[PDB]
Amino acid sequence: VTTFVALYDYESRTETDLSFKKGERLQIVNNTEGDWWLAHSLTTGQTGYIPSNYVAPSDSIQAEEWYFGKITRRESERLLLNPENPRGTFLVRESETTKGAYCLSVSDFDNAKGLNVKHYKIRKLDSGGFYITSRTQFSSLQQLVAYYSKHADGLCHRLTNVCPTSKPQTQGLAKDAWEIPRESLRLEVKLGQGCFGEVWMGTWNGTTRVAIKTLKPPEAFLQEAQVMKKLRHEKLVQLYAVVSEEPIYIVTEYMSKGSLLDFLKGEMGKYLRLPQLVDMAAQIASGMAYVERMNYVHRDLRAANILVGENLVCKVADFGLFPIKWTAPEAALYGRFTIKSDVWSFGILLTELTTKGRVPYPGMVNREVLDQVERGYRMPCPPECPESLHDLMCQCWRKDPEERPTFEYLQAFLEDYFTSTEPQYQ
Q1: Active-site residue 108, yes or no?
Q2: How far is residue 156's CA from residue 425's CA, in Å, rounded to a whole number?
Q3: 369 is in an annotated binding site
Q4: Helical segments of 250-374, H only
Q5: CATH number for the domain formed by residue range(s) 177-258
Q6: Which of 231, 243, 368, 410 has the most crowded CB, counting CB atoms within 10 A?
């Protein structure tokens, strides 16, 4: 009754932690809130720390290969939207809206709609009962799923394939790692170079694929990397460790696809449809909606400071610590850098997003822009970019910061852009 189960396959990166394959039964006595727990594999007889978020009690709903827990409706769609997923690919999660309730997200396919995802809410009747419909109830989510894996009963499709999912991100590199030794990082590929440093694709402890931001020739930054250490969100690139000795290094989560900009201009940004870029914009607003309620400020939001992953996952990087074209007037003429100037910047990012990577104000020069904008100038609606998306941009470009939307609004607006006149759940 202390047995946990591995949700995904994990590989060691230290002498103190331990590798384990998805499914293995681990033994953990003190499962107090924490990121790393000392566990014992009943399978291997091995002992070592493990990322807490990679296991779930064996006799639990979370141990269900099809229960994604508190996965957001959008990330569930992202996952469920994988082309290599037959109709009926599903997952079960907690409905983040009508709290207490549960949700069954199922993938479909119809030419007049293409790949889509139907969200059937399951009402966990207080009295225990469970149902997607009243005329049909069960005692466990495991049974409902069982039943619908053999019966459509109205559902768009019969529950078939359990929605896949790659391994998540451990929180941190190791149990206590943070200000690691420069001797552990093995830079092996350069993918950047700015006026503040470069960004390599290194390796930590030989096995770990990280990302090192070398800021070749301060110390008063460390005190800030601490607050940047706490900010934990899915749409925010994770900062693993930082080095004191100069030059100062910054190890961070590695994004296979690279920056959103390049990704846009490359040989992929073309086949990128509108619901794609809007999704990509929704992720970014989510991350910034977090940076927002955390009372923080990015100070330099743009498609260059955004990294992309596998299934069009986009994450905000560099948050915290020139780019006039992205800077809100007040920030450039008063140094007033707030979450509102950040919103301004976000509207500019919407133009790169909707213009395959095109530069904001294609025709003006740095100095020009600041002045054009002061007189009230604003970019026009890009080619084939909905006029409704431009209206959203214009709201971000309002003169008065207190007249620009919250990222919470931007996210909400962006997540429901296409399904505005449809019901949340079937």
Answers
A1: no
A2: 12
A3: no
A4: 260-265, 274-293, 329-334, 339-354, 366-374
A5: 3.30.200.20
A6: 410
